[PDB]
Design a binder for these strands. Structure first.
Lengths: 116, 65, 95, 55, 161
RNA sequence: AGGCGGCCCCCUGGACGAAGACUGACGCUCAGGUGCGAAAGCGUGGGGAGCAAACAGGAUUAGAUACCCUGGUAGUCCACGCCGUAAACGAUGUCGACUUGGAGGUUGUGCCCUUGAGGCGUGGCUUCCGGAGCUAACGCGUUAAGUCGACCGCCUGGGGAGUACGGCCGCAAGGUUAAAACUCAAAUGAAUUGACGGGGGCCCGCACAAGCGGUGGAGCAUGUGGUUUAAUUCGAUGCAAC
RNA sequence: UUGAGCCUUGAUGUGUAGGAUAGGUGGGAGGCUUUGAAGUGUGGACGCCAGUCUGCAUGGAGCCGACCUUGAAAUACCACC
RNA sequence: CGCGGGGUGGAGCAGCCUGGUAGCUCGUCUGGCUCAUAACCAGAAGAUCGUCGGUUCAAAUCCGGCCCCCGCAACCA
RNA sequence: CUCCU
């Protein structure tokens, strides 16, 4: 429980799901909540609203660590990614800075061939 | 991308630069190596560019409105 | 799927009704749930023609085939109906 | 049997919004008069954001 | 329709009480094109709603109505293979009529002896938040609030009022 | 030509332009021949992240040896050999001359007020639009499919067939050269008017949505098919007969 | 670092009823306190979110038991656990 | 042949982490949805907690006896 | 989504 002050809020924002991992400055996790585990299932995981409910259900169950202010990292080009940080302005936090950690390779490995 | 500033901030600047270069390169690179149709899609894109420029230029005569 | 044979100038014999019924049943089983089928046999002095109207969940669908001996016309009509059914079936799958 | 609904003004809006969402990044199927082209393009640019928020 | 915000006509108010909502309510259970016996059912039911409720009749009906009027209503939509329901907000003209349709259907169920006794008891439990139309109200709110995650494109309820 | 994208080094080919000097027709094309030649594949030895034929499984479907999903081996990579084909396409052999214009790109260079990203010319390579002319039309149009010249390759109805047999090459797969019997009166190119599309845009309809009442269950009436009968008169049969 | 066992201690034990986060059994109107009182500068635990423990006062000399509700009367006090 | 553990919806099991009221997925039943089946979603009943006893106010929970399992053994007449 | 003449 550790009585931490500030945290780093990683938001993995893929197409089919958003998971929200609130950690500390150090980089080791304090609590996470996903858009799947909030009652939304299948296609309904892939909405911004499930990301908002995920950010709520993380922002409490990190209450016991006592975080006043947090940074926001967002990885992934998904349908959440903005409603989930409106849901961290509204959850009672002070947003220090917001970054983008979406991995852009200087094209390396080959992508899959997926669609027809 | 990286937004930090004083108390009116945090949304518009970030969704601007984030949304443009992020959604561009990730929505591109997410699948389809293709090896062949960036050539076709750039050729069609730029032929459509010169056809749109000349088409609007000679379409700048009249429209009877 | 019940099937309803009628004939204008074509005397529908019992061997004729057995074959047509079998062919229709086989087609119904293969493509889609079908509710009712009307078959009309016409002879116009040369042309042995056949009409069929299938009532399926989406709606009516009809086909017509001219032949030489009635049997040929029936076969053509059944193949046409099957083709129409494939179109209607995944026309209302379209996932 | 009565008269036209929202006389092309905010019907021109939702045509540009549906055409904005379903691809059509032409922005080159509008009307030609100004009061309808302005919000065909208005619905188009309001539909680009609603394409970013979803798949 | 495609065209026609239609030239709309109003209705006659109720004779015994100064209400057009009540006249709409008579027109709901006015089955088979016969207004007079529906008026006798409504008056015969509001009388025993007054004696079985104490308070006045128009406020008895309206307080009994606002516990079955809804706020969100599902609209079934399909995109691709899925066919999910999307919550639209009910407009306040459709609201009370959609309440009275559920009251009248839930009174055509429930079967007691007379229609005025059935509708009187059904409005009584609608005041009590107990009967059938409150269960249908809570079904609509549970599935619209359960499917709440859909607020989208253009096929429903443009910008505001 | 195939093709070649981080950055640096070493070795090396070609093109271009300015000003001169030099050789003096030393030129063009080229059957045979020789060389290079994407990807897949084959052989030997390494290497193997990601992807991914084959393969397994889950779906989908009437079936689904498929598309979709989860995995996944050859191969993709390197070194050395082979193969020698591609929608190897500009579907346009090479070289040379001549013949109205415009807008650009890129790369040199000359003069003048570089006095300001300035103005006027000049070469090369290249993109589009159009002139006459040409073409069956589509379109090509100084980089021609215009007017000509030199040399080479190739074509002679469609199918059989770029197949068989034989030769040559290859480890193989196969490549190249290349028929005939038979059979048909067509095959084809471009353009036109319709029709059609699970193409697009716009508008509308009890087309959907919002509702009210039905049909399908029942008895009976009436009509039809069938069956019967001596006859069950004849016709009407998707919507548009019942 | 860490179990496990053993002592010495110290907290914890809101069903219902209700003045109340009363564990059982038995004894049981005596200790608390000016060894500087109720409130809180204070700081936590527990937290079945309502009440109990202890840290330091600037205050300073106060509190319950039997007598109200319960299968039950009070960590009022003590013993065995 | 004596030790342990289990007996709770149709089934798998939580509850018995502290004696105070029976709980979750499926199967089974509606309703919405779908062209119908499906998938999704929202509700509902589904048990005298294996049977007799008793231990206090009150027992699925604590303790005896019986039955049924599953293991460990004892298994050298 | 908004960088032209």
């Amino acid at each position: 429980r550790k009585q931490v002050s500030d945290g780093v809020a990683h938001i993995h924002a893929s197409f089919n799901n958003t998971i929200v991992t609130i950690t500390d400055r150090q980089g080791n996790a304090l609590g996470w909540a996903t858009a799947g585990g909030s009652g939304f299932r299948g296609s309904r995981k892939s909405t911004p609203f499930a990301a908002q409910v995920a950010a709520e259900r993380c922002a409490d169950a990190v209450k016991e660590y006592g975080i006043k202010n947090l940074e926001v990292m967002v990885k992934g080009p998904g349908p959440g990614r903005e409603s989930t940080i409106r849901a961290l302005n509204a959850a009672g936090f002070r947003i220090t800075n917001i970054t983008d950690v979406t991995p852009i390779p200087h094209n390396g490995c080959r992508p899959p061939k997926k669609r027809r | 991308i990286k937004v930090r500033e004083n108390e009116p901030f945090d949304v518009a600047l970030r969704r601007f630069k984030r949304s443009c270069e992020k959604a561009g390169v990730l929505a591109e690179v997410r699948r389809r190596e293709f090896y062949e149709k960036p050539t076709t899609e750039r050729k069609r894109a730029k032929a459509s560019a010169v056809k749109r420029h000349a088409k609007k230029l000679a379409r700048e005569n009249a429209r009877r409105t | 799927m019940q099937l309803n044979i009628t004939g204008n100038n074509v005397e529908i014999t019992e061997a004729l009704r057995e074959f047509v019924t079998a062919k229709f049943a086989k087609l119904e089983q293969y493509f889609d749930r079908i509710n009712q089928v009307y078959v009309v046999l016409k002879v116009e002095k040369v042309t042995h023609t056949s009409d069929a109207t299938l009532h399926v969940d989406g709606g009516e669908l009809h086909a017509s085939a001219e032949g030489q001996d009635m049997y040929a016309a029936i076969d053509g009509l059944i193949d046409k109906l099957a083709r129409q059914l494939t179109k209607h079936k995944d026309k209302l799958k379209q996932h | 049997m009565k008269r036209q609904k929202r006389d092309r003004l905010e019907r021109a809006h939702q045509r540009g919004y549906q055409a904005g969402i379903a691809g059509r990044s032409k922005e080159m199927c509008p009307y030609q008069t100004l009061n309808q082209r302005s919000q065909w393009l208005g619905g188009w640019r309001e539909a680009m954001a609603d394409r970013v928020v979803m798949a | 329709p495609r065209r026609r915000v239609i030239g709309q006509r109003k209705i006659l108010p109720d004779p015994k009480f100064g209400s057009e909502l009540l006249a709409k309510f008579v027109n709901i259970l006015m089955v088979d094109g016969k207004k007079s016996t529906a008026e006798s059912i409504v008056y015969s039911a509001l009388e025993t709603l007054a004696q079985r409720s104490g308070k006045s009749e128009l406020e008895a009906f309206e307080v009994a109505l606002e516990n079955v009027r809804p706020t969100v209503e599902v609209k079934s939509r399909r995109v691709g293979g899925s066919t999910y329901q999307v919550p639209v907000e009910v407009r306040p003209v459709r609201r009370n009529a959609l309440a009275m349709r559920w009251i009248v259907e839930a009174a055509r169920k429930r079967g007691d002896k007379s229609m005025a006794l059935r509708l009187a008891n059904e409005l009584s439990d609608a005041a009590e938040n107990k009967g059938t139309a409150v269960k249908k109200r809570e079904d609509v709110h549970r599935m619209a609030e359960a499917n709440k995650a859909f607020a989208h494109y253009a096929w429903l309820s443009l910008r505001s009022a």
